[PDB]
Short mmCIF file of C-alpha atoms and ligand atoms in Angstrom, two decimals:
data_model
loop_
_atom_site.label_atom_id
_atom_site.label_comp_id
_atom_site.label_asym_id
_atom_site.label_seq_id
_atom_site.Cartn_x
_atom_site.Cartn_y
_atom_site.Cartn_z
CA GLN A 30 72.22 -5.19 39.64
CA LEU A 31 74.80 -7.76 40.83
CA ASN A 32 76.47 -10.56 38.82
CA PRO A 33 76.94 -14.22 39.80
CA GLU A 34 80.36 -13.46 41.31
CA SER A 35 78.94 -10.89 43.72
CA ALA A 36 76.17 -13.42 44.35
CA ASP A 37 78.56 -15.99 45.84
CA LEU A 38 80.01 -13.30 48.09
CA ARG A 39 76.57 -12.37 49.48
CA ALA A 40 75.97 -16.05 50.25
CA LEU A 41 79.35 -16.23 52.00
CA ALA A 42 78.49 -13.05 53.95
CA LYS A 43 75.18 -14.68 54.90
CA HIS A 44 76.74 -17.95 56.05
CA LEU A 45 79.32 -16.16 58.21
CA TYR A 46 76.76 -13.81 59.78
CA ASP A 47 74.65 -16.86 60.58
CA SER A 48 77.55 -18.72 62.22
CA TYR A 49 78.53 -15.58 64.13
CA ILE A 50 75.04 -15.35 65.64
CA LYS A 51 75.23 -19.03 66.59
CA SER A 52 78.68 -18.85 68.19
CA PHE A 53 78.57 -15.60 70.16
CA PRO A 54 75.68 -15.36 72.65
CA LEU A 55 76.05 -11.56 73.13
CA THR A 56 75.95 -9.70 69.80
CA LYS A 57 76.80 -6.04 69.27
CA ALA A 58 73.07 -5.48 68.62
CA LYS A 59 72.20 -6.87 72.05
CA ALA A 60 75.14 -5.03 73.64
CA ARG A 61 74.23 -1.63 72.18
CA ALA A 62 70.60 -2.15 73.18
CA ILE A 63 71.75 -2.78 76.75
CA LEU A 64 74.19 0.15 76.70
CA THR A 65 71.72 2.72 75.32
CA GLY A 66 68.67 1.99 77.44
CA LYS A 67 66.53 0.20 74.86
CA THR A 68 66.07 -1.61 78.19
CA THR A 69 63.88 -1.87 81.23
CA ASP A 70 64.35 -5.65 81.24
CA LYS A 71 67.96 -5.47 80.02
CA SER A 72 69.32 -2.84 82.45
CA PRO A 73 72.75 -3.81 83.87
CA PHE A 74 73.99 -3.43 87.43
CA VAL A 75 76.75 -0.84 87.42
CA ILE A 76 80.08 -1.51 89.16
CA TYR A 77 81.91 1.76 89.78
CA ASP A 78 83.54 1.41 93.22
CA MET A 79 84.31 -0.99 96.04
CA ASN A 80 80.84 -1.47 97.46
CA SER A 81 79.17 -1.69 94.05
CA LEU A 82 81.77 -4.27 92.99
CA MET A 83 80.96 -6.20 96.19
CA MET A 84 77.21 -5.71 95.58
CA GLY A 85 77.54 -6.97 92.01
CA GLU A 86 79.56 -9.93 93.30
CA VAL A 104 90.22 -6.98 94.36
CA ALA A 105 92.39 -6.18 91.32
CA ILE A 106 93.74 -9.71 90.99
CA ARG A 107 90.26 -11.15 91.54
CA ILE A 108 88.90 -9.00 88.70
CA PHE A 109 91.88 -10.01 86.52
CA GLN A 110 91.30 -13.73 87.12
CA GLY A 111 87.67 -13.17 86.15
CA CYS A 112 88.63 -11.36 82.96
CA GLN A 113 91.02 -14.19 82.08
CA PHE A 114 88.41 -16.91 82.40
CA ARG A 115 85.73 -15.13 80.43
CA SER A 116 88.58 -14.53 77.97
CA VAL A 117 89.19 -18.29 77.85
CA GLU A 118 85.48 -18.79 77.22
CA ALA A 119 85.70 -16.39 74.27
CA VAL A 120 88.59 -18.49 72.93
CA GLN A 121 86.13 -21.38 72.72
CA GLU A 122 83.52 -19.25 70.93
CA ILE A 123 86.07 -17.86 68.46
CA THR A 124 87.38 -21.37 67.83
CA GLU A 125 83.82 -22.57 67.27
CA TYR A 126 83.29 -19.73 64.78
CA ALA A 127 86.56 -20.39 62.94
CA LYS A 128 85.46 -23.96 62.17
CA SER A 129 82.53 -22.53 60.22
CA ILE A 130 84.75 -20.40 57.98
CA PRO A 131 84.69 -22.23 54.61
CA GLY A 132 88.04 -23.91 54.05
CA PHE A 133 89.49 -23.41 57.53
CA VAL A 134 89.05 -26.98 58.76
CA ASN A 135 90.32 -28.25 55.39
CA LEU A 136 93.66 -26.52 56.05
CA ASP A 137 96.63 -28.38 57.47
CA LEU A 138 96.03 -28.92 61.18
CA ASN A 139 99.24 -27.22 62.33
CA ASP A 140 98.19 -24.10 60.44
CA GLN A 141 94.72 -24.21 62.05
CA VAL A 142 96.50 -23.93 65.40
CA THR A 143 98.83 -21.13 64.30
CA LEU A 144 95.96 -19.08 62.86
CA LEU A 145 94.02 -19.48 66.11
CA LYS A 146 97.12 -18.82 68.22
CA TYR A 147 97.71 -15.41 66.63
CA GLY A 148 94.20 -14.40 65.62
CA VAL A 149 92.24 -15.06 68.80
CA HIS A 150 93.36 -12.06 70.83
CA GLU A 151 92.90 -9.67 67.91
CA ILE A 152 89.30 -10.91 67.70
CA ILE A 153 88.79 -10.77 71.47
CA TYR A 154 89.63 -7.05 71.41
CA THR A 155 87.49 -6.49 68.31
CA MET A 156 84.45 -8.00 70.00
CA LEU A 157 85.30 -6.44 73.33
CA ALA A 158 84.73 -3.13 71.51
CA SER A 159 81.10 -4.13 70.88
CA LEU A 160 80.72 -4.48 74.64
CA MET A 161 82.13 -0.99 75.39
CA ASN A 162 81.19 2.63 75.33
CA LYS A 163 83.54 5.43 76.34
CA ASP A 164 82.60 5.04 80.06
CA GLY A 165 82.74 1.27 80.71
CA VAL A 166 82.31 -2.33 79.54
CA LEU A 167 79.47 -4.84 79.77
CA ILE A 168 80.34 -7.88 81.85
CA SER A 169 78.71 -11.23 82.62
CA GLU A 170 76.86 -11.40 79.30
CA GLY A 171 75.47 -7.90 79.82
CA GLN A 172 74.06 -8.31 83.34
CA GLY A 173 76.74 -5.98 84.72
CA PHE A 174 78.58 -2.87 83.55
CA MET A 175 81.93 -1.94 85.05
CA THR A 176 83.01 1.65 84.62
CA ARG A 177 86.21 2.61 82.85
CA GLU A 178 87.04 4.99 85.73
CA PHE A 179 86.86 2.11 88.23
CA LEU A 180 89.17 -0.08 86.15
CA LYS A 181 91.71 2.71 85.86
CA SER A 182 91.67 3.20 89.64
CA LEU A 183 92.99 -0.32 90.24
CA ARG A 184 96.41 -0.66 91.84
CA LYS A 185 99.37 -0.57 89.49
CA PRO A 186 99.77 -2.11 87.05
CA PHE A 187 96.24 -3.58 86.91
CA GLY A 188 94.81 -0.09 86.42
CA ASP A 189 96.65 0.05 83.09
CA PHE A 190 95.21 -3.23 81.77
CA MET A 191 92.00 -1.98 80.20
CA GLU A 192 92.60 1.66 79.13
CA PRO A 193 94.24 0.87 75.74
CA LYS A 194 91.24 -1.33 74.86
CA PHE A 195 88.92 1.59 75.66
CA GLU A 196 90.99 4.01 73.58
CA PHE A 197 90.78 1.56 70.70
CA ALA A 198 87.12 0.64 71.22
CA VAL A 199 86.06 4.25 71.07
CA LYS A 200 87.91 4.76 67.79
CA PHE A 201 86.68 1.40 66.42
CA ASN A 202 83.06 2.01 67.50
CA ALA A 203 83.03 5.24 65.50
CA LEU A 204 83.08 3.06 62.36
CA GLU A 205 79.54 1.97 63.36
CA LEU A 206 79.94 -1.60 62.16
CA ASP A 207 77.14 -4.04 62.82
CA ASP A 208 77.30 -7.77 63.50
CA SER A 209 76.88 -8.61 59.80
CA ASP A 210 80.00 -6.52 59.07
CA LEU A 211 81.98 -7.85 62.04
CA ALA A 212 81.30 -11.49 61.19
CA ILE A 213 83.28 -11.24 57.94
CA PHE A 214 85.87 -8.95 59.52
CA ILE A 215 86.87 -11.35 62.27
CA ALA A 216 87.02 -14.10 59.61
CA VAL A 217 89.50 -11.99 57.65
CA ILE A 218 91.55 -11.65 60.84
CA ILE A 219 91.75 -15.40 61.49
CA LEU A 220 92.80 -16.13 57.90
CA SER A 221 96.03 -14.15 57.85
CA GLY A 222 98.81 -15.56 55.69
CA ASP A 223 101.52 -13.41 57.28
CA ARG A 224 101.30 -15.34 60.58
CA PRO A 225 104.69 -16.64 61.81
CA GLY A 226 105.37 -20.33 61.24
CA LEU A 227 102.62 -21.07 58.73
CA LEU A 228 103.38 -24.24 56.79
CA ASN A 229 101.21 -23.66 53.68
CA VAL A 230 100.48 -19.98 53.17
CA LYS A 231 98.78 -20.18 49.75
CA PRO A 232 95.52 -21.92 50.83
CA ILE A 233 95.24 -19.46 53.71
CA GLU A 234 95.67 -16.49 51.39
CA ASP A 235 93.14 -17.87 48.90
CA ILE A 236 90.48 -18.08 51.62
CA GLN A 237 91.26 -14.59 52.92
CA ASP A 238 91.04 -13.20 49.37
CA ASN A 239 87.45 -14.44 49.21
CA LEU A 240 86.76 -13.14 52.71
CA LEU A 241 88.24 -9.76 51.76
CA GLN A 242 86.02 -9.64 48.67
CA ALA A 243 82.97 -10.57 50.73
CA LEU A 244 83.75 -7.92 53.37
CA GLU A 245 84.28 -5.26 50.72
CA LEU A 246 80.93 -5.82 49.05
CA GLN A 247 79.23 -6.10 52.45
CA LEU A 248 80.58 -2.69 53.44
CA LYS A 249 79.49 -1.15 50.13
CA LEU A 250 75.95 -2.48 50.42
CA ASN A 251 75.56 -1.92 54.17
CA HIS A 252 77.30 1.49 54.42
CA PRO A 253 76.97 2.92 50.90
CA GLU A 254 77.44 6.51 52.10
CA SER A 255 80.54 5.62 54.12
CA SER A 256 83.56 6.52 52.00
CA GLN A 257 86.43 4.00 52.08
CA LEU A 258 85.04 2.25 55.18
CA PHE A 259 86.73 -0.91 53.89
CA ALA A 260 90.16 0.70 53.97
CA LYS A 261 89.57 2.37 57.34
CA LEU A 262 88.48 -0.97 58.81
CA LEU A 263 91.61 -2.76 57.55
CA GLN A 264 93.75 0.03 58.99
CA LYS A 265 92.25 -0.73 62.40
CA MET A 266 94.07 -4.09 62.22
CA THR A 267 97.24 -2.20 63.18
CA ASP A 268 95.52 -0.99 66.37
CA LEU A 269 94.63 -4.56 67.34
CA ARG A 270 98.22 -5.77 66.95
CA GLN A 271 99.53 -2.99 69.21
CA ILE A 272 96.89 -3.83 71.83
CA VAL A 273 97.95 -7.49 71.82
CA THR A 274 101.65 -6.62 71.76
CA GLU A 275 101.14 -4.20 74.64
CA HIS A 276 99.03 -6.72 76.62
CA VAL A 277 101.70 -9.42 76.33
CA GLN A 278 104.31 -7.05 77.79
CA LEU A 279 102.06 -6.17 80.75
CA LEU A 280 101.32 -9.85 81.37
CA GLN A 281 105.06 -10.61 81.50
CA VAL A 282 105.46 -7.97 84.22
CA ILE A 283 102.52 -9.39 86.19
CA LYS A 284 103.93 -12.92 86.18
CA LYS A 285 107.21 -11.66 87.62
CA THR A 286 105.73 -9.54 90.42
CA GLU A 287 102.68 -11.75 91.13
CA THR A 288 104.39 -15.16 91.36
CA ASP A 289 101.24 -16.56 93.03
CA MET A 290 98.85 -15.64 90.21
CA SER A 291 97.93 -18.51 87.91
CA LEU A 292 97.29 -18.11 84.20
CA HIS A 293 95.28 -20.48 82.02
CA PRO A 294 97.33 -23.01 79.98
CA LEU A 295 95.05 -22.26 77.02
CA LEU A 296 96.21 -18.64 77.29
CA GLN A 297 99.68 -19.88 78.33
CA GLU A 298 100.11 -21.67 75.01
CA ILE A 299 98.80 -18.68 73.03
CA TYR A 300 101.23 -16.13 74.48
CA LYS A 301 104.15 -18.62 74.40
CA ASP A 302 106.60 -17.16 71.85
CA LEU A 303 103.98 -14.81 70.42
CA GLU B 34 85.82 11.58 40.46
CA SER B 35 88.00 9.12 38.55
CA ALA B 36 89.61 11.95 36.55
CA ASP B 37 90.68 13.51 39.85
CA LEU B 38 92.09 10.21 41.13
CA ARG B 39 94.34 9.82 38.08
CA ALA B 40 95.58 13.41 38.32
CA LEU B 41 96.47 12.84 41.97
CA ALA B 42 98.17 9.52 41.16
CA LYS B 43 100.23 11.07 38.35
CA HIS B 44 101.07 14.13 40.44
CA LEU B 45 102.32 11.91 43.25
CA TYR B 46 104.37 9.73 40.90
CA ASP B 47 106.03 12.80 39.36
CA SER B 48 106.88 14.13 42.82
CA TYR B 49 108.17 10.79 44.09
CA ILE B 50 110.48 10.60 41.07
CA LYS B 51 111.74 14.12 41.76
CA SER B 52 112.11 13.49 45.48
CA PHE B 53 113.69 10.03 45.64
CA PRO B 54 116.97 9.43 43.76
CA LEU B 55 117.03 5.62 43.96
CA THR B 56 113.65 4.40 42.68
CA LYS B 57 112.35 0.85 42.97
CA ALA B 58 112.62 0.36 39.21
CA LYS B 59 116.32 1.23 39.39
CA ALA B 60 117.15 -0.77 42.53
CA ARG B 61 115.58 -3.94 41.08
CA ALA B 62 117.62 -3.80 37.88
CA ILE B 63 120.74 -3.29 40.00
CA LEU B 64 119.73 -6.32 42.06
CA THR B 65 119.68 -8.26 38.76
CA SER B 72 127.02 -3.87 39.32
CA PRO B 73 127.55 -3.04 43.01
CA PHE B 74 130.41 -3.60 45.38
CA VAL B 75 129.35 -6.52 47.60
CA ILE B 76 129.99 -6.60 51.35
CA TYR B 77 129.81 -10.11 52.78
CA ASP B 78 132.84 -10.26 55.11
CA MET B 79 134.74 -8.31 57.73
CA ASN B 80 137.47 -8.20 55.07
CA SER B 81 135.00 -7.06 52.39
CA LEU B 82 133.48 -4.31 54.55
CA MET B 83 136.96 -2.83 55.01
CA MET B 84 137.52 -2.56 51.27
CA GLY B 85 134.00 -1.19 50.81
CA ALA B 105 129.29 -2.59 63.75
CA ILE B 106 129.06 0.81 65.38
CA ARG B 107 130.50 2.35 62.20
CA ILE B 108 127.71 0.69 60.17
CA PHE B 109 124.83 1.72 62.46
CA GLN B 110 126.01 5.33 62.28
CA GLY B 111 126.13 5.24 58.48
CA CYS B 112 122.57 3.90 58.43
CA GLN B 113 121.74 6.82 60.74
CA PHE B 114 123.34 9.23 58.26
CA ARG B 115 121.39 7.86 55.31
CA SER B 116 118.15 7.92 57.32
CA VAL B 117 118.56 11.63 58.11
CA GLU B 118 119.09 12.09 54.37
CA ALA B 119 115.88 10.19 53.65
CA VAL B 120 113.93 12.19 56.25
CA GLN B 121 114.62 15.25 54.09
CA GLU B 122 113.58 13.55 50.84
CA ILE B 123 110.33 12.40 52.45
CA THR B 124 109.68 15.87 53.89
CA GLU B 125 110.00 17.40 50.42
CA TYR B 126 107.75 14.67 49.04
CA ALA B 127 105.18 15.26 51.80
CA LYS B 128 104.87 18.91 50.83
CA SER B 129 103.87 17.95 47.30
CA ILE B 130 100.85 16.05 48.68
CA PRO B 131 97.77 18.21 47.90
CA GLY B 132 96.57 19.75 51.15
CA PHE B 133 99.54 18.74 53.31
CA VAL B 134 101.04 22.24 53.45
CA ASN B 135 97.67 23.72 54.39
CA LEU B 136 97.49 21.63 57.56
CA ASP B 137 98.22 23.07 60.99
CA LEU B 138 102.00 23.50 61.12
CA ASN B 139 102.21 21.47 64.33
CA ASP B 140 100.21 18.71 62.60
CA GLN B 141 102.57 18.68 59.62
CA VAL B 142 105.43 18.26 62.10
CA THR B 143 103.65 15.44 63.97
CA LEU B 144 102.78 13.55 60.77
CA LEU B 145 106.40 13.57 59.55
CA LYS B 146 107.80 12.81 63.00
CA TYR B 147 105.65 9.69 63.46
CA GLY B 148 105.60 8.68 59.80
CA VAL B 149 109.23 8.78 58.59
CA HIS B 150 110.21 5.50 60.27
CA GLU B 151 107.33 3.72 58.53
CA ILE B 152 108.24 5.26 55.15
CA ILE B 153 111.97 4.48 55.47
CA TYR B 154 111.41 0.73 55.98
CA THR B 155 108.75 0.71 53.26
CA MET B 156 111.27 2.16 50.82
CA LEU B 157 114.16 0.12 52.18
CA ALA B 158 112.25 -2.98 51.07
CA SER B 159 112.67 -1.64 47.53
CA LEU B 160 116.46 -1.93 47.99
CA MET B 161 116.31 -5.36 49.61
CA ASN B 162 116.02 -8.93 48.50
CA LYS B 163 115.96 -11.98 50.75
CA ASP B 164 119.78 -12.04 50.55
CA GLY B 165 120.76 -8.41 51.22
CA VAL B 166 120.24 -4.67 50.84
CA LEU B 167 121.49 -2.09 48.36
CA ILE B 168 123.53 0.75 49.87
CA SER B 169 124.94 4.09 48.71
CA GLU B 170 122.68 4.92 45.75
CA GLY B 171 123.02 1.24 44.90
CA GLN B 172 126.80 1.56 44.64
CA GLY B 173 127.05 -1.27 47.18
CA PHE B 174 125.31 -4.40 48.40
CA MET B 175 125.53 -5.65 51.98
CA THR B 176 124.36 -9.15 52.67
CA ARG B 177 121.69 -10.27 55.08
CA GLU B 178 124.08 -12.94 56.38
CA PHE B 179 126.89 -10.49 57.13
CA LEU B 180 124.50 -8.08 58.93
CA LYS B 181 123.13 -10.99 60.96
CA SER B 182 126.69 -11.86 62.10
CA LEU B 183 127.35 -8.57 63.88
CA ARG B 184 127.73 -8.80 67.63
CA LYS B 185 124.70 -8.19 69.88
CA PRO B 186 122.44 -6.18 69.65
CA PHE B 187 123.55 -5.08 66.22
CA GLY B 188 123.19 -8.47 64.49
CA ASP B 189 119.44 -8.43 65.22
CA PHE B 190 118.75 -4.91 63.92
CA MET B 191 118.08 -5.74 60.28
CA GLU B 192 116.72 -9.30 60.41
CA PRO B 193 113.11 -8.15 61.06
CA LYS B 194 113.40 -5.64 58.19
CA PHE B 195 114.37 -8.49 55.84
CA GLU B 196 111.48 -10.66 57.03
CA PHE B 197 109.19 -7.68 56.38
CA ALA B 198 110.63 -6.80 52.95
CA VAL B 199 110.23 -10.41 51.80
CA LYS B 200 106.47 -10.38 52.38
CA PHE B 201 106.14 -6.78 51.17
CA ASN B 202 108.08 -7.25 47.93
CA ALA B 203 105.88 -10.30 47.13
CA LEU B 204 103.17 -7.73 46.40
CA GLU B 205 105.25 -6.66 43.37
CA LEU B 206 104.34 -2.98 43.72
CA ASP B 207 106.11 -0.54 41.47
CA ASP B 208 107.06 3.11 41.95
CA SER B 209 103.67 4.40 40.79
CA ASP B 210 101.99 2.23 43.46
CA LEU B 211 104.45 3.13 46.23
CA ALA B 212 104.15 6.89 45.68
CA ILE B 213 100.47 6.76 46.65
CA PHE B 214 101.01 4.21 49.42
CA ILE B 215 103.69 6.45 50.93
CA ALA B 216 101.37 9.48 50.88
CA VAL B 217 98.71 7.34 52.63
CA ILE B 218 101.12 6.54 55.48
CA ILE B 219 101.94 10.21 55.93
CA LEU B 220 98.28 11.26 56.25
CA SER B 221 97.59 8.98 59.23
CA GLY B 222 95.03 10.69 61.47
CA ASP B 223 95.99 8.58 64.50
CA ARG B 224 99.43 9.99 65.27
CA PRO B 225 99.51 11.14 68.91
CA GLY B 226 99.13 14.83 69.59
CA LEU B 227 97.35 15.83 66.38
CA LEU B 228 95.19 18.95 66.77
CA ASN B 229 92.90 18.85 63.70
CA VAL B 230 92.38 15.24 62.58
CA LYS B 231 89.56 16.04 60.14
CA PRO B 232 91.52 17.36 57.09
CA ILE B 233 94.13 14.63 57.57
CA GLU B 234 91.51 11.89 57.26
CA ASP B 235 89.86 13.86 54.47
CA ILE B 236 93.12 13.89 52.48
CA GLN B 237 93.97 10.29 53.31
CA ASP B 238 90.47 9.23 52.18
CA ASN B 239 91.27 10.86 48.84
CA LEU B 240 94.64 9.09 48.76
CA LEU B 241 93.06 5.74 49.59
CA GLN B 242 90.67 6.11 46.65
CA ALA B 243 93.58 7.00 44.40
CA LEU B 244 95.59 4.00 45.61
CA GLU B 245 92.67 1.60 45.18
CA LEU B 246 92.03 2.75 41.61
CA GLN B 247 95.78 2.67 40.88
CA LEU B 248 96.18 -0.93 42.05
CA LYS B 249 93.12 -2.06 40.09
CA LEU B 250 94.43 -0.55 36.85
CA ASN B 251 98.11 -1.40 37.38
CA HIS B 252 97.42 -4.92 38.76
CA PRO B 253 94.05 -6.08 37.38
CA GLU B 254 95.02 -9.69 38.11
CA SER B 255 96.12 -9.33 41.74
CA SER B 256 92.84 -9.77 43.57
CA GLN B 257 92.36 -7.62 46.68
CA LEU B 258 95.89 -6.19 46.41
CA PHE B 259 94.60 -2.97 47.99
CA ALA B 260 93.46 -4.91 51.07
CA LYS B 261 96.67 -6.92 51.33
CA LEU B 262 98.75 -3.74 51.10
CA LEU B 263 96.78 -2.03 53.89
CA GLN B 264 97.26 -5.12 56.07
CA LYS B 265 101.02 -4.72 55.66
CA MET B 266 100.81 -1.53 57.73
CA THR B 267 100.30 -3.84 60.70
CA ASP B 268 103.71 -5.48 60.24
CA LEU B 269 105.26 -2.09 59.43
CA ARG B 270 104.27 -0.50 62.75
CA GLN B 271 105.26 -3.61 64.71
CA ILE B 272 108.66 -3.34 63.03
CA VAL B 273 108.98 0.36 63.92
CA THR B 274 108.08 -0.14 67.60
CA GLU B 275 110.50 -3.09 67.89
CA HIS B 276 113.21 -0.96 66.28
CA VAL B 277 112.52 1.87 68.74
CA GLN B 278 112.84 -0.38 71.80
CA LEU B 279 116.04 -2.02 70.54
CA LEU B 280 117.45 1.46 69.79
CA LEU B 295 127.63 18.41 68.01
CA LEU B 296 127.75 15.15 66.12
CA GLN B 297 125.11 13.66 68.41
CA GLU B 298 122.95 16.76 67.95
CA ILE B 299 122.39 16.09 64.24
CA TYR B 300 120.80 12.67 64.95
O1 LRA C 401 87.47 -4.43 81.56
C1 LRA C 401 87.38 -5.65 81.50
O2 LRA C 401 88.06 -6.42 80.64
C2 LRA C 401 87.65 -7.74 80.95
C3 LRA C 401 87.48 -8.41 79.72
C4 LRA C 401 88.53 -8.30 78.82
C5 LRA C 401 88.48 -8.94 77.58
C6 LRA C 401 87.37 -9.69 77.23
C7 LRA C 401 86.31 -9.81 78.13
O3 LRA C 401 85.20 -10.54 77.79
C8 LRA C 401 86.37 -9.17 79.36
C9 LRA C 401 86.59 -7.56 81.87
C10 LRA C 401 85.88 -8.42 82.58
C11 LRA C 401 84.79 -9.09 82.06
C12 LRA C 401 84.06 -9.96 82.86
C13 LRA C 401 84.43 -10.13 84.19
BR1 LRA C 401 83.45 -11.28 85.25
C14 LRA C 401 85.51 -9.44 84.72
C15 LRA C 401 86.23 -8.58 83.91
C16 LRA C 401 86.53 -6.30 82.25
O4 LRA C 401 85.69 -5.76 83.16
O1 LRA C 402 126.04 4.72 52.91
C1 LRA C 402 125.89 3.94 53.85
O2 LRA C 402 126.67 3.92 54.96
C2 LRA C 402 126.16 2.84 55.75
C3 LRA C 402 127.28 1.99 55.79
C4 LRA C 402 127.39 0.84 55.03
C5 LRA C 402 128.55 0.07 55.11
C6 LRA C 402 129.61 0.42 55.93
C7 LRA C 402 129.51 1.59 56.68
O3 LRA C 402 130.54 1.95 57.49
C8 LRA C 402 128.35 2.36 56.60
C9 LRA C 402 125.04 2.37 55.01
C10 LRA C 402 124.18 1.43 55.45
C11 LRA C 402 124.40 0.72 56.63
C12 LRA C 402 123.48 -0.24 57.07
C13 LRA C 402 122.32 -0.48 56.33
BR1 LRA C 402 121.02 -1.77 56.87
C14 LRA C 402 122.09 0.24 55.17
C15 LRA C 402 123.01 1.19 54.73
C16 LRA C 402 124.90 3.08 53.87
O4 LRA C 402 123.97 3.01 52.85
#
């Protein structure tokens, strides 16, 4: 049986899972059900070429649409972060820094829930845009999404569920090694609890899965490379597409990342 | 299983001690006596000439790490191409990991610890050289705060080598199988050696994220020429 210390972690796991469900309208559970045909009511329209894209309704237009759903996810992530115990008690400046650096890493984590090896759910699951079609977009927009797919397919082999992911994206937000943090110790103390709660969660939920905890934390290096690679591509786009406007919310996040 | 994990941890420590002349235990006592380089004048008595010497020492380290890799149980039984890929893509990560052992926030040991070059001097070198080592110092500061010792680093290092995500690997299965074993051994080791540092295993794994960022940044910024 468990002790009282484990007991507080289960309650923390429960609270975070609960807030996750309340902040993200499209869970992995819903996304996998749509992707695998648990559907007849949840079947998505598939976008795989020019006419199907138009029927669902070029490269810049898709990009602008990705950006603004991405801004929407910033709001959801920020809403979730407020529910992480201790986060809103932290110094305000550090709240911003943690969101600044953590938000994209979470966006790509959750994006993975929306993907299989052949495409990505869009518009809260009503559409599905193939990976082949995204890669066919004119340079360099065709290169935007492939590294997320390569990651998603490796990350999705961990077979995490929403109860696991809830704590994992909390651990991401609460990183003490973020640049420019005023007070690192309170951040680390919260992540230590989160790391304990994730570890027990993975042992109970995936008891046959050896060292899943460690393999999940190692995926954090993938996320950083995705973000670091996406920032580079964005810098190229701005220079060659001088007439393409980026969101100031995202502007402020990339600024000196 | 725990008996196995200790055997592996001891085996790796033994090998690490054999393979690496300047251990963390030694470097730290030295850092607390070496010839100090702080000045153009002081370097003389001790920018391109310094980068090349770092290149020399790194080639030296690549050989120590190679020898150490081959003591890792199962490593030599991997596909020969996979052994080459793992070392190729892993040595940069190991070198900066172990360079942290020779670093404090003020400088880095050099030449078996015979010398000490200061962070401030290295920062003063003309572009792009002055900005080569600053991100390694930032990294070593946060890494050394974990207070790992040589018995901890020997398993951590082996973990880095057995990374199943290096590009071009042919048989990823035994690599992840071995690393899984190493990860267990590291987790147990950090619990016994640091029973008071909560979640030190997790925090150490997270440091791989900074490590790889550092290596990529260093790559971008980057008969005699044949050797290097
Ligand atoms: O491949 C895509 O990446 C976009 C994306 C990236 C990151 C997060 C997200 O929610 C969507 C995205 C997307 C999502 C919705 C809309 Br409308 C347009 C593009 C893709 O099709
Ligand atoms: O033996 C070494 O040669 C390098 C070196 C140091 C000082 C002057 C020099 O010409 C070469 C050098 C070195 C240079 C940069 C960094 Br950083 C770490 C070591 C050694 O350890």
